[PDB]
Ligand binder design. Structure first.
Ligand SMILES: Nc1nc2c(ncn2[C@@H]2O[C@@H]3COP(=O)(O)O[C@H]4[C@@H](O)[C@H](n5cnc6c(=O)[nH]c(N)nc65)O[C@@H]4COP(=O)(O)O[C@H]3[C@H]2O)c(=O)[nH]1
Ligand SMILES: Nc1nc2c(ncn2[C@@H]2O[C@@H]3COP(=O)(O)O[C@H]4[C@@H](O)[C@H](n5cnc6c(=O)[nH]c(N)nc65)O[C@@H]4COP(=O)(O)O[C@H]3[C@H]2O)c(=O)[nH]1
Length: 75
């Protein structure tokens, strides 16, 4: 399970924040979960985020865990 902590997402360094924040906003909106504090995403979404961020998926996963946005279990 890939679960994003939206509160922590507000504290990702501003240089990296935009794309992830829009991607989460859009999924949350499409689901109609406007009041949610956390957001599960598809495995395919993590691979898409790796492309957007030009990172190895392992690196991006570890980054998102270090920022507290993904849980350790995401590994
Ligand atoms: N529990 C569960 N239900 C699933 C899953 N996949 C699809 N569904 C259900 O099937 C719906 C239609 O899926 P969709 O055509 O992909 O249409 C989806 C999709 O295009 C997009 N969306 C929603 N959530 C995500 C997401 O986490 N990631 C991505 N990439 N797109 C999403 O917004 C649409 C509307 O989402 P919903 O209103 O939630 O409506 C979803 C949802 O009720 C799943 O892996 N698990
Ligand atoms: N083709 C297809 N596959 C399905 C469907 N439902 C579930 N799966 C598969 O089963 C996995 C787990 O579903 P989940 O526990 O609901 O766990 C899902 C779920 O909580 C949520 N999710 C993903 N997409 C949607 C969505 O469109 N709507 C909603 N409400 N939740 C979603 O994100 C989690 C992870 O998504 P995935 O990595 O894709 O991982 C999904 C996906 O591979 C479906 O209707 N169609």
């Amino acid at each position: 399970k890939l679960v994003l902590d939206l509160e922590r997402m507000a504290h990702v360094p501003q240089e990296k924040a935009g794309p992830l924040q829009r991607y989460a906003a859009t999924i949350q909106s499409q689901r109609g979960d406007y009041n949610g504090k956390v957001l599960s995403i598809r495995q395919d979404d993590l691979r898409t985020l790796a492309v957007i961020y030009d990172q190895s998926p392992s690196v991006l996963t570890e980054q998102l865990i270090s920022w507290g946005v993904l849980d350790a279990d995401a590994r």
